């Protein structure tokens, strides 16, 4: 029942979820004083991302974001264990303030952010089990800016009116998830952090790509107006808007970059 | 006991201090989309700021900042009530990331920030009693950046070595506190917010001057390195660094400015 707004908003999540008040919290502001190039951050490879258009994948409103379940044969190659996909979801702002990324760069929000959540399948049976274990999760984050219409993100957004309320589910035909990543995926920021939602487990290896992708103003408006945190029949509806956490203190951490300049 | 780092850091303040998770929280990012010129915002008058050079004022390290006590005949004229001074103090970062103001401007931190705390003396007998009451407090905030040596800030900084550890004290001879204000004090941001420290009561009328002041690199490194949060005998000393709160969400609200151009 945590939220992003009001009594149950983010400054109160530590009252029920202790790790939200603990170390290694995400998101953070990516700024020069804390960046250091690391030549050992070699390119990731995205395997099994081209999902069959003849198969379908479950989209669900979970009361906090919209998530698409992903198959465990989809994985990242190039980390020190195989990380297999489990779901992707987004964070965004609202129609009058389309500035709802979680990570910021030199103090600036992007319009929205996509997280593709993977868990260490070499060591764990599922993401749920991985989530409270050492380097159990790895997230790929894409910063999203207002720009051109994006047909690939639209393969998710064209289903939003069928998942408006908490608990609703819809099926999305498979498409190539790598089309949601930006240009030059070899350039990224890497750091050790946490889930950005309760229970804020400090068990995530973050990769934030350097380059944003664009979606249009109309696609942002659809995402910002389609969805509710609450059930269909709730007499106290709450719009799913501004579902991003503020940046966190970077208390002694560095962020490592695969690009020098 | 509340701190800015570790288990007792800002995400954890709302357990004991519930207003830290309530409405009207400060600090905030001051960015162009939420600014609105208000011609009602006339210049404040700083009355009794030229402190008798024949009086001494108590400087303390209270384990959270360095604070200078101020006399109640020093006040602001121009508000709906008279607001009398009680104390000033500062917030800063650390030498590896020397960007520790509390307010930001277009997403950017300044090096440090000075707050001159005043209370509504027309309504209340002292700042403690006013702190949790309607219209209780008014703070002037000066943004600080690195540049020229500043003799006036040195009137406080030259006593830092005497207040290294928590509980220590020193006496500062009176000087003209208006020298700590920037140029063109007619130009400011104004909004209703809260204490940025526990108990975070939403009872502060903020005035953040538009223009920063400068201190030298050596004065800024002194402020960042001079003080500890802990008592002198504490076998586990903690440096007093990064003593600023992260910015808070601020949606469907305006910050009024005395300047348009
Ligand atoms: N916003 S984010 O940080 O990318 C994030 C959001 C939700 C989840 C999960 O729910 C993973 S499954 C789980 N996690 C904790 C406790 C039981 N199950 C994981 C991640 Cl990495
Ligand atoms: N950082 S800040 O927001 O300028 C701020 C910091 C501390 C104090 C006080 O200590 C006011 S006196 C007091 N406050 C709360 C409880 C008992 N006494 C007041 C303000 Cl406005
Ligand atoms: Zn996320
Ligand atoms: Zn302060």
Swiss-Prot record, chains A, B:
Tissue specificity as recorded in UniProt: Highly expressed in colon, kidney, prostate, intestine and activated lymphocytes. Expressed at much higher levels in the renal cell cancers than in surrounding normal kidney tissue. Moderately expressed in pancreas, ovary and testis. Expressed in sweat glands and bronchiolar epithelium.
Keyword terms: Cell membrane, Disease variant, Disulfide bond, Glycoprotein, Lyase, Membrane, Metal-binding, Signal, Transmembrane, Transmembrane helix, Zinc
Example GO biological process: estrous cycle
Catalytic reactions on record: hydrogencarbonate + H(+) = CO2 + H2O
Family: Belongs to the alpha-carbonic anhydrase family.
Required cofactor names: Zn(2+)
Disulfide-bond pairs as recorded: 20-200
Membrane topology: Single-pass type I membrane protein
Binding residue positions for substrate: 196-197
Annotated active site: 64
Disease implication from the record: Hyperchlorhidrosis, isolated: An autosomal recessive disorder characterized by excessive sweating and increased sweat chloride levels. Affected individuals suffer from episodes of hyponatremic dehydration and report increased amounts of visible salt precipitates in sweat.
Entry function: Reversible hydration of carbon dioxide.
Broad class of the protein's primary localization: membrane
Positions annotated with a glycan in the UniProt record: 50, 132
Catalytic activity, EC: 4.2.1.1
Organism whose genome encodes this protein: Homo sapiens (Human)
Key word Transit peptide present: no
Subcellular location(s) per record: Membrane; Cell membrane
Binding site for Zn(2+): 89, 91, 115
All residue ranges annotated as the Alpha-carbonic anhydrase domain in the record: 1-259
Single GO term (MF): carbonate dehydratase activity
Protein name, entry field: Carbonic anhydrase 12
Residue ranges, Extracellular side: 1-261
Regulation: Inhibited by coumarins, saccharin, sulfonamide derivatives such as acetazolamide (AZA), benzenesulfonamide and derivatives (4-carboxyethylbenzene-sulfonamide, 4-carboxyethylbenzene-sulfonamide ethyl ester, 4-(acetyl-2-aminoethyl)benzene-sulfonamide, 4-aminoethylbenzene-sulfonamide) and Foscarnet (phosphonoformate trisodium salt).
UniProt gene name: CA12
One GO cellular component, as annotated: plasma membrane
């Amino acid at each position: 029942k945590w939220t992003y707004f009001g009594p149950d908003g983010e400054n109160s999540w530590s009252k029920k979820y202790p790790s939200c008040g603990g170390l290694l919290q995400s998101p953070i502001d990516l700024h020069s004083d804390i960046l250091q190039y690391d030549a050992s951050l070699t390119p990731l490879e995205f395997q099994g991302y081209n999902l069959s258009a003849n198969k379908q994948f479950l989209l669900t409103n979970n009361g906090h974001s919209v998530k698409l379940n992903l198959p465990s044969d989809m994985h990242i190659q190039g980390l020190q264990s195989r990380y297999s996909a489990t779901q992707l979801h987004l964070h965004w702002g609202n129609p009058n303030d389309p500035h709802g990324s979680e990570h910021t760069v030199s103090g600036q929000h992007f319009a929205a952010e996509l997280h593709i959540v993977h868990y260490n399948s070499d060591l764990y049976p599922d993401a749920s089990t991985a989530s409270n274990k050492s380097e159990g999760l790895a997230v790929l984050a894409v910063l999203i800016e207002m720009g051109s219409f994006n047909p690939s993100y639209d393969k998710i957004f064209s289903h939003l009116q069928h998942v408006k309320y908490k608990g609703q589910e819809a099926f999305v035909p498979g498409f190539n998830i790598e089309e949601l990543l930006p240009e030059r995926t070899a350039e990224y920021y890497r750091y050790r952090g946490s889930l950005t939602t309760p229970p804020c487990n400090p068990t995530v290896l973050w990769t934030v790509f350097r380059n944003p992708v664009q979606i249009s103003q109309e696609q942002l408006l659809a995402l910002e107006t389609a969805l509710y945190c609450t059930h269909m029949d709730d007499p106290s509806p709450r719009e799913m808007i501004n579902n991003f956490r503020q940046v966190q203190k970077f208390d002694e951490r560095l962020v490592y970059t695969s690009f020098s300049q």
